[PDB]
Every structure is written in structure tokens, then in C-alpha cells.
Design a protein around this ligand. Structure first.
Ligand SMILES: *[C@@H]1O[C@H](CO)[C@@H](O[C@@H]2O[C@H](CO)[C@@H](O[C@@H]3O[C@H](CO)[C@@H](O)[C@H](O[C@H]4O[C@H](CO)[C@@H](O)[C@H](O)[C@@H]4O[C@H]4O[C@H](CO)[C@@H](O)[C@H](O)[C@@H]4O)[C@@H]3O)[C@H](O)[C@H]2NC(C)=O)[C@H](O)[C@H]1NC(C)=O
Ligand SMILES: *[C@@H]1O[C@H](CO)[C@@H](O[C@@H]2O[C@H](CO)[C@@H](O[C@@H]3O[C@H](CO)[C@@H](O)[C@H](O[C@H]4O[C@H](CO)[C@@H](O)[C@H](O)[C@@H]4O[C@H]4O[C@H](CO)[C@@H](O)[C@H](O)[C@@H]4O)[C@@H]3O)[C@H](O)[C@H]2NC(C)=O)[C@H](O)[C@H]1NC(C)=O
Lengths: 106, 103
């Protein structure tokens, strides 16, 4: 469980495991990766952070009760999925912000 | 109970930025705090990814829940003292939280 800095980790999400395959016709699953890692003090530019996150991580080093910045998706991409409308017609809809492209500390 | 914006006044003398920052003496930075419940309900400024992570978390604990982080940020202007001892007016983007959400 060793501490590491904020980055992107792989995650394949199979819809049958989540019970979504009842409504989603395709795909069976997708590579939706996830963000995880520590956002150290002082936080870097290269960690895709905001001035607020630099300030909050600083406030934490003085008051531990205030959390540091979370490692979160900063850049997301879309995926197309198929579903069945009311009259059994197949529909193709683009789902915004489904895949993590880059992580960052916020 | 859930993800919301909470007030956080940031005083520079308490933070140690007193030396380089001339004005203001601090500012109302605000901070995000709260639960990202399962299943993710409306009005929480979430992404579809956050809904997906949240649901995978309920089936696999190794995968964390979505974090409550700032989703909208505004700027503040500051007066700072540079290397040459001249007091400079600068704009600092993304300093104040305007809205929180589950990401
Ligand atoms: C800070 O944020 C930045 C910005 O987000 C992060 O840097 C970005 O990093 C990602 C890669 O991790 C990158 O996105 C790629 O762009 C390339 C452009 O040429 C593509 O080659 C690449 O496509 C593959 O991956 C995508 C999913 O990530 C898929 O949509 C696609 O099908 C491609 O897949 C290949 O590899 C996979 C392996 O999983 C395989 O399954 C595929 O079939 C195929 O072999 C990405 O779209 C950006 O280019 C980066 N931008 C910059 C400016 O560097 C940065 O790392 C963040 N910091 C932290 C700490 O996370
Ligand atoms: C989901 O995200 C949305 C989008 O971010 C969030 O909705 C926004 O919420 C904000 C914050 O309340 C709100 O922004 C205000 O707009 C007001 C007009 O409607 C302005 O009055 C206000 O400006 C004041 O506060 C700022 C900081 O927020 C200051 O920098 C500024 O100087 C202003 O100061 C006034 O009020 C303060 C009290 O804090 C006082 O000291 C001063 O004397 C002065 O009276 C904000 O900019 C947006 O209007 C919302 N947008 C929409 C579309 O609804 C939403 O809350 C999120 N959900 C969660 C859970 O976070």
C-alpha cells in the first residue's frame, strides 16, 4: 500500500459486474482508468494543479485538519455506447467524460 | 452531509507568505468538504466517470470513491515584493473556489 505521487492507474470496468449490462447493449466494458496518489507539500506545477490546490496543501502543513489536494481526473475523454429505446430501436449515444486522460492534484 | 463549499480564510502571516506578499493580508479561499454518496444523486456537479468509480467502489474497495474537489475557480489580485524590492501588482488565477463537485 506504499505511498506514491498522484498518477493514472489502469481500470477495466465490465458492466456486468456493476449490473449496467441490463441497459447498455455495447460495449461489454471499457478502460476507465482512475486517479490515485499523494499530492505532496509543496506541490509541483507538473502535478496538473491549481493555485488553490498549492494554497490548500500549504494550509494543511500548518493545520492538518484541512485536507491536502485530492488526486483527481483533470482531463477526460468520451466513449460511444449503444442502448435500446422504448420501441426496441438501437440508439448510439456519445458519453462525455468517461475515460481518464490525465490526473492532477486539486 | 455531502460535498459542498466551506469557508477558509487564508492568512499569509500564519502561512509564512507575509515576507513576499504585501497585500491583501489574506483572502477568502474556500474549500470543498463532504461525502460523495452511493449511488451519486443529482445537484453534485459530478462527471460520468465519478458515477462509474463510485459504483465500482461499492463492488471493489481497492478502487476509491470520488473526491470532493473545486469545479469552478475565480482569480484574485495581489501585491508582492520582487527580487529588486519593487512592489508589483499581479493577477493569480484559480485562487477562490466558486463551486464543488464529485470527481
Ligand atoms: C497531466 O495531464 C496531462 C494531460 O492529460 C497528462 O498527459 C497526457 O497523457 C495521456 C497518456 O497517459 C495522453 O493521451 C494520449 O495521447 C496520445 C496522442 O498521440 C495517444 O497516443 C494516446 O492514445 C491511447 O490511449 C488512450 C487512453 O488514454 C486511448 O483513447 C487510445 O485508444 C490509445 O490507446 C493505446 O494504448 C492503450 C493502453 O491502455 C491500448 O489499450 C490501446 O488500444 C492503444 O494501444 C492517448 O490519447 C496525452 O497525450 C497527454 N498529454 C500531454 C500534453 O502530455 C499527464 O500525464 C498528467 N499528469 C499526471 C500526473 O497524471
Ligand atoms: C455546483 O457548481 C456550481 C457552479 O460553480 C455552484 O454554483 C455557483 O455557486 C456560486 C458560489 O455561491 C455562485 O457564485 C456567486 O454568484 C453570486 C451571484 O449569484 C455572487 O454574489 C458571488 O460573488 C460573491 O462571492 C464570491 C466567492 O464565491 C466572492 O469572491 C465575491 O467577492 C462576492 O462576494 C459577495 O458574497 C460574499 C459572501 O461569501 C461577501 O463577503 C461579499 O460582501 C459579497 O456580498 C458568487 O460568485 C454561482 O452563482 C453558482 N452558479 C450557478 C449556475 O448556480 C454550485 O454551488 C455547486 N454545488 C456545490 C455543492 O458546490
Amino acid at each position: 500500500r506504499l505511498k506514491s505521487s498522484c498518477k493514472r492507474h489502469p481500470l477495466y470496468v465490465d458492466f456486468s459486474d456493476v449490473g449496467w449490462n441490463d441497459w447498455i447493449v455495447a460495449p461489454p466494458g471499457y478502460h476507465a482508468f482512475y486517479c490515485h496518489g499523494e499530492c505532496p507539500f509543496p506541490l509541483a506545477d507538473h502535478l496538473n494543479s491549481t493555485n488553490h490546490a498549492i494554497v490548500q496543501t500549504l494550509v494543511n502543513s500548518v493545520n492538518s485538519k484541512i485536507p491536502k489536494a485530492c488526486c483527481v481526473p483533470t482531463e477526460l475523454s468520451a466513449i460511444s455506447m449503444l442502448y435500446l429505446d422504448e420501441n426496441e430501436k438501437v440508439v448510439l449515444k456519445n458519453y462525455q467524460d468517461m475515460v481518464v486522460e490525465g490526473c492532477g492534484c486539486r
